[PDB]
From a paper:
The membrane-bound EssB is an integral and essential component of the bacterial type VII secretion system that can contribute to pathogenicity. One of these is EssB, a 50-kDa bitopic integral membrane protein that is conserved among T7SS gene clusters in Firmicutes.
A higher resolution structure of EssB-CΔ, residues Ala241 to Gln397, resulted when the flexible C terminus was omitted from the recombinant polypeptide. Approximately 75% of residues are in α helices arranged into a series of coiled-coil motifs that are predicted to extend across the cytoplasmic membrane. The structure starts at α1, with Ala241 at the transmembrane border, potentially the continuation of the helix that transcends the membrane. The asymmetric unit of EssB-CΔ consists of four molecules, which are labeled A to D. An average rmsd value of 1.38 Å is obtained from the least-squares fit of the Cα positions of individual subunits with each other. The dimer is primarily formed by interacting residues on α1, α2, and the loop linking α4 to α5. However, with a solvation free energy gain of −14 kcal/M (estimated using PISA; Krissinel and Henrick, 2007), the dimer is predicted to be thermodynamically stable. The extracytosolic E273C showed a major distance distribution of 44 Å, compared to the value of 43 Å derived from the EssB-CΔ crystal structure, essentially confirming the assigned dimer structure and ruling out the physiologic relevance of the crystallographic dimer contained in the asymmetric unit (AD pairing) with a theoretical interspin distance of 49 Å.
Author numbering:
A (entry chain D): 0, 241 to 390
B (entry chain A): 242 to 390
Amino acid sequence: TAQPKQEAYIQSTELFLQNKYSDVITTLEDYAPEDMPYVIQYELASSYVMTESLTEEQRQTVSNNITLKTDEQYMLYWIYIGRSQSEEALELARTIEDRDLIVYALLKYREQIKGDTDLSGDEKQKKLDEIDQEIKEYERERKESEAQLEE
Amino acid sequence: QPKQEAYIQSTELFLQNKYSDVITTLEDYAPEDMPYVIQYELASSYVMTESLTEEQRQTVSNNITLKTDEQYMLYWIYIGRSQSEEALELARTIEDRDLIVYALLKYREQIKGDTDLSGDEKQKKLDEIDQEIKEYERERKESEAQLEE
Ligand SMILES: [Cl-]
Ligand code: NA
Ligand code: NA
Ligand code: NA
């Protein structure tokens, strides 16, 4: 006997050890990240983070380093970002209290609002505006932090 | 000739910061044939509507000036238009590491969603891009601290 999970873990390990990020991702796509062994969370999260379209600036800004010392929450954050579950990544970021991760998740959430088809134009616009205001607030906080550190 | 009027309307929109309106005004036209200043308008408009903080948008677009080479403007227009293959080829021609890496990542996504490619061809392409990305990442880490000596 059926142990499809057991097998996918071995399979993702084989692909990861070869840097086959995309293939790791599709191997694991039907599986809940919260129940994965820590090494498998590591493989998946690394795979998502390695393939996230970040500019050099974004890259400098966000906590996108993943190691076998990195806390589970950071791995879950990047896995949800990777799966386009920005709502889930947003509330993780807030729990973590990582400013730039909240901002990054707010940006992905903005896109999802922009594309949402169930929302009317007015509810749409209101929400984008709420988001941009929150982003600007955090951006203001980052700037003031950097100002104090240069004093 | 409606082309000329599009350039004029895109200018009218650009000067009001109506970046997304600039983009739609020019959507049908080829970027290579556009006058330098319109390439600037379009490139800037794509950058100003990317998913980035305001500060990040400023940082990229403040680097795009009317003394900037046409190539950097074409790069951003391709990115903005999801012509990531084209952005990548240009990026390698420019020989700027950062633009190659960003374009690879966006190209990866183009492949990921390409309907014409078969199941197996898609995967082999992604496998290749994935390995290249690891290679750039390994070089990134090595530059950060060479640990000599
Ligand atoms: Cl993917
Ligand atoms: Na490989
Ligand atoms: Na970083
Ligand atoms: Na500029």
